[PDB]
Each structure stands twice: as C-alpha cells, then as structure tokens.
Curated annotation (Swiss-Prot), chain C:
Keyword Glycoprotein attributed: no
Keywords of this entry: Ribonucleoprotein, Ribosomal protein, RNA-binding, rRNA-binding, tRNA-binding
GO biological process, one term: cytoplasmic translation
Role of this protein: In the E.coli 70S ribosome in the initiation state it has been modeled to contact the 23S rRNA of the 50S subunit forming part of bridge B1a; this bridge is broken in the model with bound EF-G. The 23S rRNA contact site in bridge B1a is modeled to differ in different ribosomal states, contacting alternately S13 or S19. In the 3.5 angstroms resolved ribosome structures the contacts between L5, S13 and S19 bridge B1b are different, confirming the dynamic nature of this interaction. Bridge B1a is not visible in the crystallized ribosomes due to 23S rRNA disorder.
GO molecular function terms noted in the UniProt entry: rRNA binding; structural constituent of ribosome; tRNA binding
Family to which this protein belongs: Belongs to the universal ribosomal protein uS19 family.
Organism (species): Escherichia coli (strain K12)
Subunit structure: Part of the 30S ribosomal subunit. Binds S13 and L5 and cross-links to the A site tRNA.
Top-rank taxon, per record: Bacteria
Cellular component aspect of the GO annotation: cytoplasm; cytosol; cytosolic small ribosomal subunit
Keyword rRNA-binding found: yes
Protein name in the entry: Small ribosomal subunit protein uS19
Swiss-Prot record, chain D:
Originating gene: rpsJ
The name this protein goes by in its record: Small ribosomal subunit protein uS10
Alphabetized UniProt keyword annotations: Ribonucleoprotein, Ribosomal protein, Ribosome biogenesis, RNA-binding, Transcription, Transcription antitermination, Transcription regulation
Single GO MF descriptor: transcription antitermination factor activity, RNA binding
Subunit structure: Part of the 30S ribosomal subunit. Can also form a heterodimer with the transcription antitermination protein NusB. Binding of S10 to NusB is mutually exclusive with its incorporation into the ribosome. The rRNA transcription and antitermination complex (rrnTAC) consists of RNAP, NusA, NusB, NusE (this protein), NusG, SubB, ribosomal protein S4, DNA and precursor rRNA; S4 is more flexible than other subunits.
Curated annotation (Swiss-Prot), chain E:
Alphabetized InterPro entries for the sequence: Ribosomal_uS14, Ribosomal_uS14_bac/plastid, Ribosomal_uS14_CS
PROSITE patterns noted in UniProt: RIBOSOMAL_S14
Molecular function as annotated in GO: rRNA binding; structural constituent of ribosome; tRNA binding
Pfam families assigned to the protein according to its UniProt record, in alphabetical order: Ribosomal_S14
Family as reported in the entry's similarity comment: Belongs to the universal ribosomal protein uS14 family.
Name of this protein: Small ribosomal subunit protein uS14
Any one of the GO BP annotations: ribosomal small subunit assembly
Coiled-coil spans in chain: none
Quaternary assembly: Part of the 30S ribosomal subunit. Contacts proteins S3 and S10.
PANTHER family for this protein: 30S RIBOSOMAL PROTEIN S14, SMALL RIBOSOMAL SUBUNIT PROTEIN US14M
GO cellular component: cytoplasm; cytosolic small ribosomal subunit; small ribosomal subunit
Signal sequence range: none
From Swiss-Prot, chain F:
UniProt protein name: Small ribosomal subunit protein uS9
The encoding gene: rpsI
GO BP annotation list: cytoplasmic translation
Native organism: Escherichia coli (strain K12)
Assembly: Part of the 30S ribosomal subunit. Contacts 16S rRNA. Cross-links to the P site tRNA and weakly to the A site tRNA.
Family: Belongs to the universal ribosomal protein uS9 family.
Classification via Pfam families: Ribosomal_S9
Length: 151, 206, 82, 99, 101, 127
RNA sequence: CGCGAAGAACCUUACCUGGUCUUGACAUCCACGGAAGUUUUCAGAGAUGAGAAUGUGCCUUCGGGAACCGUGAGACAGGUGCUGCAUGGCUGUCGUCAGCUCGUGUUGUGAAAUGUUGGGUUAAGUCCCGCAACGAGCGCAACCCUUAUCCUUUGUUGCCAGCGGUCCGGCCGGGAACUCAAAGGAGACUGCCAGUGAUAAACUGGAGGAAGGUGGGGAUGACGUCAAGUCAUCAUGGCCCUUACGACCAGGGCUACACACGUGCUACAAUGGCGCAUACAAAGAGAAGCGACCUCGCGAGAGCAAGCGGACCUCAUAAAGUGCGUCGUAGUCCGGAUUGGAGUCUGCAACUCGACUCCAUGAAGUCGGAAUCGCUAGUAAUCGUGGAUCAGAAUGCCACGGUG
C-alpha cells in the first residue's frame, strides 16, 4: 500500500436478523470457506445465550462485545535500532475487529464439547467481565498505560 | 533476454501458414512427416535455385506444392523437364500423386530467407562479415523496405572468442502485431564452425 | 500376484527339469530364468540361478514350491555401512 | 429424404465461405436448405517445455481450433446431388456427407 | 545420434506387426474358459514364449520421427517437444498458433 | 403478458418470467424452500422484491442452469431485477443504489504455469 | 534438488557380469550367386547354427534392367566418447524493471558532455511547459486472445415461453420466443458535468452505464549481465576409438541404506468420524479407443454386448453441502503406517520391482525448537473433476468448476 489507497468492500446483512456486525462475526469464525457451518454455530450459540441468561436477542451480543473492545493500543516506532512502544487510539472498526477476533480465539481454546457452547460460555463471561478475552483486553491496556510516557 | 519467434506470434493475424491441409489425429503425424520429407528434398536439390518458401496444400487425397523462387528459370528449366523430374519424385515421397506450381518473388532483396542465404553464401566464400552485412542492409533499404536489421554470431573472422554483431537501419517494431515483419535464419558452415545469421525486414503495418 | 489362471514357467527350464528327474540328479542346473514358479516336479534337485554375475545354487525343499526362483538369489551385495 | 453435410476446418473464414458456396449452390437448383448451424468449436491445447535442458517452469502453450458447420438439405431433386458433388473448395475444408 | 537405437526401434515396429495384431489368437482367444479349461490353454501359454522376445506392442518406445528422442513425445504430431516447437513457430503445423485464454 | 429477465452469475444462467397477481415462487418445478436449503440463498432471491415491495403481487416462474448454490441464487436475483425493470421501467433508479442491477463480473481466475494455483506460488527457500 | 524424465518390471538404457560379431545393427557404390514373403525342424538363456515348400513382377528395345536375400574386398559406416572455456540454435536471470542509444548541431586540448537535466504529472524517458539543442530508433502504451452487457443472422444432435396431446420423460405434434452455440456488429474515450491546477499536462468527486479511469486475466521480455545452462534433442570446429570407446543377446542395476537436506501428501480430530437419505458444475478425452444395459462376484472385476470418430454414445450418480441417527473429548468409532493371508487385471513375464480389492494387524502422531514461506478478491483457504505421458503404473505437472 505505497501508492494505491483503497476504499471498502460490501458485506451482506444476516438472513435471520439483518445485522452487518454479526455477519462480520461469522466471517471471522468461518474456516475454510464453510459459511453454512459458521452460521449454524453462531445462531446455535447466540440463542443459547439469549434464553438461558439474557435479553432481547441482539442486545445480549453487544453487551458482551463492549466489555472486550479496547480503547488504546501499542504500536512500535524505530529510532536507529530502538523501537518505542507508543500508545495509540484505536479506530472504531478496528475496535470491533479486535473484540471479535479475541472472542473467537478465546472460544476456540476451551475444553467443552461443542463450538456453539464454547462460544456461549465465552460470551456469557464476557458479559460478566471475566474469562480470557476480557483479560486479553485488560493486559493490552496494562501495557498501554505502562508506556504512557511515550505519548 | 529471449525473444518470441516473430513469424510464430503473427500466425493468423497477418502471416499465413506454410501448410494448409486438414486431417484428423489419425493421419496427422504422417502427413506432417511426409511434408517434412518433401520440404527437405525441395530444400536440398534446389539449393542454388534461390527458393524462399514452400507452401504445401493437400486436397482430398493428393498434394500440391507451390515453390516461391527468385530464379524461376532454373526450377522451370529448359522447356520444363525439371518440374517433371521433381513431381515424379514428390509423388514418390508423399505416396499420393503430386502437382507442382512455381511462384516468382520479384524483389529477392526484400526477403529474409534470400538475404540470409546470400550472407551465409558469402561467409562461406571467406568474405569479411562487415561487408556482407552492410551490403545486405543498403540493398534492402534502397528498394523501399521500411526497416531491416541483420545479425551474425559466432567466431567471426576465425577469432577464438565468438561474438554477436548486428546492424540495424530504418524501423523494426517487433512488439507491434500489425507489423509486416519478414524474418528468417540461416547458418554458414565454415572451417572454424557454424556462424548464425538472422534477418528482420519490416515492410509496413496492417 | 499373478492370476490363478495358470502359473508361469519357461520352456527350456521345464524340459531341463523333466529330463533331469528322468536322468537322476546331476550338475547344479544352470539357469537365468528367475521368473519361473517352482513346481512339485523338482523337489530334491539343485538349481544354480543367475543373480547378475554368478549362479547361486539352491536345493529345492518342499516349502519352496509356489515361490519364484529369483527369491533365492539376492541380486545386491551389502553388509553394513561403517 | 434428408442429406446431411458436416464441414470441419482449422480457420473460420474458409469454412464460412465454403458453407456459403454450398448453401447457395443448393438454392441454385431450387432446394430447401436447413441451416447452416455452427456447432461448438473443439480446441485442443498443448503445453511444451521450451528449453533443451533443465528449465521446468519455462513453457509454451499452443492450441488448434476445429470449427464445425452443419447443413441439412430436405428437398433434393436429382440435379442437387451431382450439383453438390462437383464443387471446388480450397484444401482447408473436410466435408462428410450423410444419406 | 545413436543410429543403432533407431534401427532397434524400426526393427521392433516391423517385427511386431509381423506377428501380433495377426496372431493374438494364441492369448486373446485360447485363454477363454469357453476355449479351454485344460491342457489346451496350458499349451498355448507355453507356446506364447517361443515367439521372439520382441513382436510385442509393449516394447516400442515411441521415439521422435526426426531426432529419435525417447522423452517429451507427443502422439498428436509424432515429434518431440523441441521439434514441434521449432516447426510450429516456422508455420508448418497447420492451425497451431500460440494459445492465450 | 410475461415480463422476462435474464440473469447470470459465476457460471450460472437464470431466466425469469413474472406474471401479475399471485404468490407462486417456482424454480425448476420446485418450491423456493425445496430448492435452496440455505436461508442465505433464500434471502438473496427475496432481496429485489423487498424494496420493490409485495405481499403476493406477482408470481414468478424461474429456471436456472450451471454453477452452484450461490451462483444460481445471484443469477436469479439479477434476472428478477431485469424482469421487473421491464415491468415498471422506472424502478431502475433505486435498484441502481441497491447494487442489484450491476452484473457481478467476478470469474474464477485461470491456473498459471509455474504456479500451484491462480496466484499461490511454490514454497521458496534460499538454499 | 516432484529439475532434463509428458510416466526405469522386459524395452527405455546410455551402466555391470557373461555369451557373441568385425565393411558391420544403420547408408552409397562394385562383383557373383539367389526373385521377396511362406512355416515348420532339433540344439542354445538368447543372440545365433542345421531340412521341406515356394515364388518368377517386368518390359525385354531377349545381354539382362527394376524390388528383396546371401557372400567377398575396399573407400567407409558407427560413437549418448572429451572440450558449452572453440561454436550455432534454444533457455534461465536481473525484470514487464523503465530504461538503452544514435544522426546532425554545439561545448571541451581530450576521455567525454548536451539532448536524456529542470518545474509539474503518470503505471510508464507517460504527457505538458521551460531549455544549445533539433530530430529519430529499440523499449512504455495501442494493435492480438479471453472474460463481463446488448443487437443482427442461422436453429440440430442444443432450447421449451405460448399452444394441442401424453404412458407425465421435451417425449410426440409443434414453436424460433428464451438459455445456448458461433459468425458479424455495437460499447469506455477522462467521452460528459463540477472543482483544483501555471488560460497547461493531469489529478479528486458526480451523473449515465453491464463495465470508469490500464474494467479483470494472458500472450508480448528493449541494450545488455552472469566465459550462467545444454556437444546426452539436434547441428557443428578440433581431439580420440576403428577385431573396439562400434554392434547383438540373456540376467542384473538405475528402486541399495548408518545418515543429512529440498519439495509434496495424509494426520493429530467434534467447524469432526461413521451410517442412511437427498441437491447444485465446468472443462475435457475416445477406434489396437471410450465401452452403456442386463447377469455373476462382498469387492477389485468377469461374461454378454448396444451406441459412438461424437452439442447425439461412453468415460461419468461431482465432492464439500443439507436433513436424521450415533459417537461424547479417550491415543478414541481420531489416525491408517507396517505386516500376515486370500485375490483381480495389464503384460512373453509383476522375485528383485506394478497398480487395485477383501479379511485381519492398528507404529508414530495430541498442533510441532532456532528459524522460515505464500497470498491484496472470486485472491488465500478447502472440496471434488479432467488431460498429456501411457500395455499397466501420480501425493508430480498442466487445466476446470463449487464454497469462499
Ligand atoms: K514389477
Ligand atoms: K550457447
Ligand atoms: K552527439
Ligand atoms: K563436437
Ligand atoms: K532391472
Ligand atoms: K507428495
Ligand atoms: K517436507
Ligand atoms: K482406531
Ligand atoms: K497409463
Ligand atoms: Mg512403454
Ligand atoms: Mg479453485
Ligand atoms: Mg515445480
Ligand atoms: Mg540514461
Ligand atoms: Mg544530462
Ligand atoms: Mg516515449
Ligand atoms: Mg527537455
Ligand atoms: Mg431469436
Ligand atoms: Mg506492450
Ligand atoms: Mg561455464
Ligand atoms: Mg556443466
Ligand atoms: Mg557430457
Ligand atoms: Mg538388457
Ligand atoms: Mg532415478
Ligand atoms: Mg486428542
Ligand atoms: Mg499485487
Ligand atoms: Mg482433501
Ligand atoms: Mg487433477
């Protein structure tokens, strides 16, 4: 990306709800181009949150999403052979992307039977501000305010 | 870098094929090789008759070979015993009967095959390559050619180290597919080895 | 392996072996045909089968019937590396 | 009856004019001519190594296209058959007739 | 060059249509269970061996027609890859132009 | 009268006939729910008849060929678009803004010599 | 370093052991004797050595001349023997990088410079201004192929909207609308509208449009560099062999195995494994070939046998996908290496050394150290299909579509 600056690419809403955010979620969960599998898994986990521990069925997702979204990041900048870890503000879309990626990768490394109920537990405890996605956020923060002097 | 063959890249665009028969994959290979044999003959017995192109065409079950030549009198001979003594053996080689026609090239200095043959014939007569090359270029350019370039390569003048020496004049746009490019190659077998000659002649676009 | 529709054996080996079982056992029968099935007909005779440079003698026991002759003459020499 | 004519060639202009020559010489004897129809062209591809030795990724790709034309005649008077069997076309066209 | 290899190959071709595609009856037919299930089929299996080691269609290497190269053969033209390229660029194989799709 | 439309996607081709005044979606002599088992294909086919709204205001007889599920669904969308554009002739302006009118011209890229895929390169290593 | 090799059981084959030949396996010329082919005979591993039968084409311008065989003596044949650092031809590479030069003029004693630098701009030595330069050439771009929209023509073997009939299958009558096929034509040009810009060249944005700024992909590789690669495709200067470094045959070997490296395939599972049911492709090949239906076999396959030189017939019922059931986190109903037994088929012949099937066996492996590779969109990832080579023998190579 030296010269050619890029616009954006379209994305469909979700059949069942009509969301772009959750359509992003299932693209990030999809593996190998198996979209049907990922739609099945994500619907199966999200209703499992809603009527087991939860609200109106789109709200129950965003409440777990907001508590893992980071507000500050670290990016590194070189001197002549030194690189400072400078804290930077994260842009909205990158906030959603980082949150979704951390949720998916925390759900992938659990020990329960299905992927739907793994996702279910992780989103449920992200709603309760514990687990490992939220602590991923907490320690990216920790490191960002450890280097607060290099702003 | 290596170049594309300038006649091959223009087949079907502006340059036609040298064989215009049809065949299924049953008789394709033998058609091809009997064409090779006839071409090898009509190369090697018309050696000093200045033949430039041999077009082979196969109607239903028999052949006709059109010989483009600069010196039609020797390939038509003394009242015409010689196209007889040629078709009697071409019908012998291709197994089917044969017919022979003879077309004249009227300016033998605007054909890459004849110019290459000329330069190799002079090189085998122990002539300085510079003089051959420059005479070819000036003779081709004084007859209306829009461009020409010749190139000789390999132990020029008996040197121990081979060299490639080329001479260009006019305009030879090898990257233009519209371009009327007449290209050909020849080899001179001297007492120090083989010397390769390539000739490009540009006559116009479309 | 081969089809059950006929085992294979050569002609010259077949005739050499029949005449050797009529005439009593003899010299190690020199052969090059490593591809021929061992038959019941030559239990007891010694066949020296070619292995590339030599003729290895084999004394046919009844356990060998059904195998090929070449199985009893190794073609490659090898005994350790270092 | 019906007579069926299949034309194969390596280029499309020669076979185009050959099909013309057929279908107007068929209307010249006053016959009904069904067609001409272009059947799908069959293109055979070849891929060759282009160095003399040890250069696996350097290759050339060629193709031969065979063009196929079909024409049916459905009202043959006796002067249509001979009138089609006397016709002179250049060497690139292979014709197959079917009674 | 190795002219002797070309001689071997042409001898195999000639001797092979000499015997087989004419006397395949010794294997294609007599092996049939409807032809024999006994000493006849055995006698045929042993007769198939006294025919020369050649004369099989399975011993032709199918070399090039001009240089005699074993490898890179193309059944469509009867030439090696080198010869089909050198002759295709010169414009001698009908209809064979460079493909780009 | 019939109002007709042709639509095409990756390798599929769909012809669409619309009649006034009934609610049948029938594709290849089958229901929509019998044909497309995936609700995303069902959603893509109902897209153009959601801005151009209906209850059961036109019935549509569709056939399709070639391609897979997504290709056929996109082809049917494009065909419905063209057919209803022949029907009204001035629903065009808002269909342009929905992206339903542009023929998606993304085709699968050819495999190239020396490459394992269209662009995937063999594993390189310095030595 | 899945490179020559687009396919080493024999052959290929160039290597080894042994058995053999010497004007020769391949070619021309000379002399003599036999027309060529036939189809059996015993020895030999085989190359090679030993009888019967036979033909007589052809004009004889009646000596024999033409095809094929045997023997003799020589010019000679033959060499995948060496030199790619003697060469031609062909190829890789920097690199599809934007450059590399020339004529005339001018400047400098001269090697040389200028032009080709400068201000902008572009993917581009692309274009515009300015300028001791003025012009030109090879490159860039365009012309070529393919893909994305529409129109015209033709309408089977391809198609089925409106019609009649039907055994409910476009299958019959029938239609020429539609998909499609393949010829021709149209379309995109910063063409249009705003703004910025040095009244510039061009940049941002908008409209219309199937497509917008090189629309996507390919072919196309400038002057030259690396004494780069190939004398084993071929061709070729010189050197070397000439009862052998040439030629024929059988068996073996190129498949060895303490190890090290490169490129791939299959896994370590639940986004999964197994069982049943059921959808949606594209592009190809086929006459010593593709081989349907039916019958037999658990299966690989076998028997019989139609159709097809092919928009008709066959290869050939796509798989991932969807629905239901089960397994429930285990070295497992994961993995399928290794080995034993029984077979099929191709082929003179599967020991060394083929592919596939059935029953049994069920290693390692639980996501991989230092480190390292590919990819910017129908791409990556994954899932099947086809082709060349080829009697048989792909996890390789070259192509095609699905999901994405
Ligand atoms: K084997
Ligand atoms: K060279
Ligand atoms: K100058
Ligand atoms: K040499
Ligand atoms: K071997
Ligand atoms: K592999
Ligand atoms: K590896
Ligand atoms: K197991
Ligand atoms: K094969
Ligand atoms: Mg073979
Ligand atoms: Mg793909
Ligand atoms: Mg490779
Ligand atoms: Mg410069
Ligand atoms: Mg300068
Ligand atoms: Mg320029
Ligand atoms: Mg200037
Ligand atoms: Mg029409
Ligand atoms: Mg260009
Ligand atoms: Mg070197
Ligand atoms: Mg070397
Ligand atoms: Mg060598
Ligand atoms: Mg051998
Ligand atoms: Mg090897
Ligand atoms: Mg495990
Ligand atoms: Mg890129
Ligand atoms: Mg797979
Ligand atoms: Mg494949």
């Amino acid at each position: 990306p030296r010269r050619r600056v890029i616009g954006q690419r379209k994305i469909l809403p979700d059949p069942k709800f009509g969301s772009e955010l959750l359509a992003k979620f299932v693209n990030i969960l999809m593996v190998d181009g198996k979209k049907s599998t990922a739609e099945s898994i994500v619907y199966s986990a999200l209703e499992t949150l809603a009527q087991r521990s939860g609200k109106s069925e789109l709200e129950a997702f965003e409440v777990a999403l907001e508590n893992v979204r980071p507000t500050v990041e670290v990016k590194s900048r070189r001197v002549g052979g030194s690189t400072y870890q400078v804290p930077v503000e994260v842009r909205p879309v990158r906030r959603n992307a980082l949150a979704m990626r951390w949720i998916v990768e925390a759900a992938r490394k659990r020990g329960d039977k299905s992927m739907a109920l793994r996702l279910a537990n992780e989103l449920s405890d992200a709603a309760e501000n514990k687990g490992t996605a939220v602590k991923k956020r907490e320690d990216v923060h920790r490191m960002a305010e450890a280097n607060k002097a290099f702003a | 870098g290596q170049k594309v063959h300038p006649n091959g890249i223009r087949l079907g665009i502006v340059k036609p094929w040298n064989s215009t028969w049809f065949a299924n994959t049953k008789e394709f290979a033998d058609n091809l090789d009997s064409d090779f044999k006839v071409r090898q003959y009509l190369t090697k017995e018309l050696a000093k008759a200045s033949v430039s192109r041999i077009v082979i065409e196969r109607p239903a079950k028999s052949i006709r070979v059109t010989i483009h030549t600069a010196r039609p009198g020797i390939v038509i001979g003394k009242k015409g015993e010689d196209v007889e003594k040629l078709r009697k053996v071409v019908a012998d080689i291709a197994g089917v009967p044969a017919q022979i026609n003879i077309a004249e090239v009227r300016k033998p200095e605007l054909d890459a095959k004849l110019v290459a043959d000329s330069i190799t014939s002079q090189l085998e007569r122990r002539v300085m390559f510079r003089r051959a090359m420059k005479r070819a270029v000036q003779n081709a350019m004084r007859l209306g050619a829009k461009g020409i370039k010749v190139e000789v390569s390999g132990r020029l003048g008996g040197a121990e180290i081979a060299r490639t020496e080329w001479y260009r004049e006019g305009r030879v746009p090898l990257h233009t597919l519209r371009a009327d490019i007449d290209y050909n190659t020849s080899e001179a077998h001297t007492t120090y080895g083989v010397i390769g000659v390539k000739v490009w002649i540009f006559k116009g676009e479309i | 392996r081969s089809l059950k529709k006929g085992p294979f054996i050569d002609l010259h080996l077949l005739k050499k072996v029949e005449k050797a079982v009529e005439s009593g056992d003899k010299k190690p029968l020199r052969t090059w045909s490593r591809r021929s099935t061992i038959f019941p007909n030559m239990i007891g005779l010694t066949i020296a089968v070619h292995n590339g440079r030599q003729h290895v003698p084999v004394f046919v026991t009844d356990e060998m019937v059904g195998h090929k002759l070449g199985e009893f003459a190794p073609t490659r020499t090898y005994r350790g590396h270092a | 009856q019906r007579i069926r004519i299949r034309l194969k060639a390596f280029d499309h202009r020669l076979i185009d004019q050959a099909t013309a020559e057929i279908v107007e010489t068929a209307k010249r004897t006053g016959a009904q001519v069904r067609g001409p129809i272009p059947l799908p062209t069959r293109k055979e591809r070849f891929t060759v190594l282009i160095s003399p030795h040890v250069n696996k990724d350097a290759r050339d790709q060629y193709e031969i296209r065979t063009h196929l034309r079909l024409v049916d005649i459905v009202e043959p008077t006796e002067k249509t058959v001979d009138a089609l069997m006397r016709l002179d076309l250049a060497a690139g066209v292979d014709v197959q007739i079917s009674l | 060059a190795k002219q002797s290899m070309k001689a071997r190959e042409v001898k195999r071709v000639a001797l092979a249509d000499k015997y087989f595609a004419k006397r395949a009856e010794l294997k294609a037919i007599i092996s049939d269970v409807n032809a024999a299930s006994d000493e006849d089929r055995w006698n045929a299996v042993l007769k198939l061996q006294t025919l020369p080691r050649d004369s099989s269609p399975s011993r032709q290497r199918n070399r090039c027609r001009q240089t005699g190269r074993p490898h890179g053969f193309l059944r469509k033209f009867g030439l090696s890859r080198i010869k089909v390229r050198e002759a295709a660029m010169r414009g001698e194989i009908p209809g064979l132009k460079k493909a780009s799709w | 009268n019939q109002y007709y439309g042709t639509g095409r996607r990756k390798s599929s081709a769909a012809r669409v006939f619309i009649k006034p005044g009934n609610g049948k979606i029938v594709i290849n002599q089958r229901s929509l729910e019998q044909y497309f088992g995936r609700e995303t294909a069902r959603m893509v086919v109902r897209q153009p008849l959601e801005l151009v709204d209906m209850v059961e205001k036109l019935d549509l007889y569709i056939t399709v060929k070639g391609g897979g599920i997504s290709g056929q669904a996109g082809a049917i969308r494009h065909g419905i678009t063209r057919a209803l554009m022949e029907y009204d002739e001035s629903l065009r302006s808002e269909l342009r803004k929905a992206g339903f009118v542009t023929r998606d011209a993304r085709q699968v890229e050819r495999k190239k010599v020396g490459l394992r895929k269209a662009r995937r390169r063999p594993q390189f290593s310095k030595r």
